[PDB]
Amino acid sequence: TLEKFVDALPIPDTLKPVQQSKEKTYYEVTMEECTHQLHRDLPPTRLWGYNGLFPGPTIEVKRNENVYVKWMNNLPSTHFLPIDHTIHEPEVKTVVHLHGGVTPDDSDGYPEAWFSKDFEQTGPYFKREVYHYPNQQRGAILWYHDHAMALTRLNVYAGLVGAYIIHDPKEKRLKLPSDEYDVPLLITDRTINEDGSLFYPSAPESLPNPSIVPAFCGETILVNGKVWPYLEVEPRKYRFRVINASNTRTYNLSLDNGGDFIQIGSDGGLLPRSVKLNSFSLAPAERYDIIIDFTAYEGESIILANSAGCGGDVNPETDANIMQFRVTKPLAQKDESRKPKYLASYNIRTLKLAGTQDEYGRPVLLLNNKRWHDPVTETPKVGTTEIWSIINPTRGTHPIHLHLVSFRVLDRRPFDIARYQESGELSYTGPAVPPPPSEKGWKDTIQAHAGEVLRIAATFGPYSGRYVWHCHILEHEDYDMMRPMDITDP
């Protein structure tokens, strides 16, 4: 297996605008096939990257900055990963979703708004080449990634992911670590062949060939596009924007010297109060805004470790490892940053997760026993607030993402699975559990654990129109755990 911690952690450069005035910022981003060495000991890997980079460039904007992005397809006309033609016209379709954006519906990256090379052919919901991001929302870690119908798992695995940070000037007074000491960490698990080519399975364990798989667990962990990298840090406080950009894998992170993280933010921005954590779970598309205080660790080498299984227990030599901090950089200036505790102050619908079998015996995961193409049923009115009760009788956790909105977590409550099977009665096995401090703020991708009812509160606005909601395990999303969500407007 590849030798750990021999490549320095890359820091993606921040995208520079094509045009910027005091009232509008314009960017162009092209998806290109490219080659990058993912590890010292590998030949370069064929990838698809935004602007030919993996991950794509970090996009930085200010709250309320009026942003326009022309996303363009410069990719080949055929895929290099295995395409399953049975889960449903050009083979390569792309569309960019700004994950967490408060975005008008025609710029949200609707899965059927895809386009092929040079916009030659486009999906039924395609309407505009330049997307509009008003950024009228709390400061937060967003990220952007491909979202094309029936291809999202492949296009994201190919490398189509990157970071997008909303800075709110009103948070500067908190004096959290900034500039060189504010570092995105985009975590992606991969399986890589000896010749450096990406491996993605074409079959699970009659079946069509290739065939979609129900889950993908990569053999190797990458951060910002390098296998098991190291980062040299100064003995001081850093801010890290941790993004799970993996297809399926959930991480449970910790530092092997016993140190603690300080969580300051979740998907939807700063928490009300920061929280000291020895470990934390991060499912696909979740984000954790954290501070790590390296002051007392000068000279140490610290491993960011992982304890969560993916199809089995972690391997201490491989996926138990994420990256390595080396506290050996000399202080370049006094640490003037802070870690405050106080940070800020801030209809019902039942939905069922379930899994059926298709004509090949393969599992199909569904929201409310509906298929993507069935007539829309989630149709809240613009400006209204709802409590969604998400029932999970499956054996695993599903990370549920709603577009446009962020929401508060109300509680989780365990129920009797076997009973729910027979009669559909919710026989509760214990009292409701309010969210821990990590979930007392705003979320947009939330872990619905097995055997539990999860309640979230969301206000459906400011915009109206056709969005989606779905599980963010990409293998589930593509077959077929995604539904349209219509926010109706008089």
Closer to Cu ion at the Cβ: 343 or 454? Answer: 454
CB of 245 to Cu ion, least distance (A): 9
Q: Is 310 annotated as a binding residue?
A: no
Q: In whole angstroms, how close is the CB of 410 to Cu ion at the nearest point?
A: 21
Pick one of 223, 473, 474, 485: the residue that binds Cu ion (CB under 5 A): 473
Among residues 437 and 462, whose Cβ is nearest to Cu ion? 462
Q: Is 403 annotated as a binding residue?
A: yes
Query: Judged by CB, which is closer to Cu ion: 237, or 403?
Result: 403
Closer to Cu ion by CB, 5 or 143: give it.
143
99 binds Cu ion (CB under 5 A): yes
* Token duo for residue 384: 């209204």
Q: Provide, rounded to whole angstroms, the least separation between the CB of residue 474 and Cu ion.
A: 9
Alpha-carbon Rg for the chain in angstroms: 22
- Give me the 274-313 binding string for Cu ion, x by CB under 5 A, dash otherwise: -----------x----------------------------
Whole-number minimum distance, CB 144 to Cu ion, in Å?
Answer: 8
Minimum distance, C-beta of residue 257 to Cu ion, in the bound complex (Å): 32
Of 404, 476, 478, 486, which one interacts with Cu ion (CB under 5 A)? 476
| Chosen residue from 398, 408, 412, 443 binding Cu ion by CB under 5 A | 398
Residue 79 labeled ligand binder: no
* 449 annotated among ligand-binding-site residues: no
Q: What is the 3-state secondary structure (H, E, C) of the chain?
A: CCCCCCCECCCCCECCCCEECCCCEEEEEEEEEEEECCCCCCCCEEEEEECCECCCCEEEEECCCCEEEEEEECCCCCCCCCCCCCCCCCCCCECEEEECCCCCHHHCCCCCCCECHHHCCECCCCCCCEEEECCCCCCEEEEEEECCCCCHHHHHHHCCEEEEEEECHHHHHHCCCCHHHEEEEEEEEEEECCCCCEECCCCCCCCCCCCCCCCCCCCEEEECCEECCEEECCCCEEEEEEEECCCCCCEEEEECCCCCEEEEEECCEEEEEEEEECCEEECCCCEEEEEEECHHHCCCEEEEEECCCCCCCCCCCCCCEEEEEECCCCCCCCCCCCCCCECCCCCEEEEEEEEEECCCCCEEEEECCECCCCCCCECCECCCEEEEEEEECCCCCEEEEECCCCEEEEEEEEECHHHHHHHCCCCECCCCECCCHHHCCCECEEEECCCEEEEEEEECCCCCEEEEEEECCHHHHCCCCEEEEEEECC
Q: Would you say 147 is a known binding-site residue?
A: yes
* Cα–Cα distance for residue pair 48/58, rounded to 1 Å: 16
The yes or no reply on residue 138 touching Cu ion (CB under 5 A) is: no
Binding mask 418-457 for Cu ion (x = CB under 5 A): ----------------------------------------
Stretch in the footprint of Cu ion (CB under 5 A) among 43-51, 329-337, 402-410, 435-443: 402-410
- State the number of binding residues for Cu ion (CB under 5 A): 7
* Block residue for tokens 């990719």: 75
Among 471, 474, 485, 487, binds Cu ion (CB under 5 A): 471
Closest CA relative to residue 436, chosen from 412, 415, 452, 406:
412
Among 36, 190, 237, 403, binds Cu ion (CB under 5 A): 403
The minimum distance between CB 117 and Cu ion, in angstroms, equals 23
Q: Is 99 a known ligand-binding residue?
A: yes
Binding mask 48-87 for Cu ion (x = CB under 5 A): ----------------------------------------
Contact region with Cu ion (CB under 5 A), list: 12-20, 191-199, 264-272, 394-402: 394-402
> Is there a binding annotation on residue 149?
no
Decide whether 50 or 230 has the Cβ nearer to Cu ion: 50
Annotated binding site for Cu cation: 97, 99, 145, 147, 398, 401, 403, 470-472, 476, 481
Q: Which residues bind Cu ion (CB under 5 A)?
A: 99, 285, 398, 403, 471, 473, 476
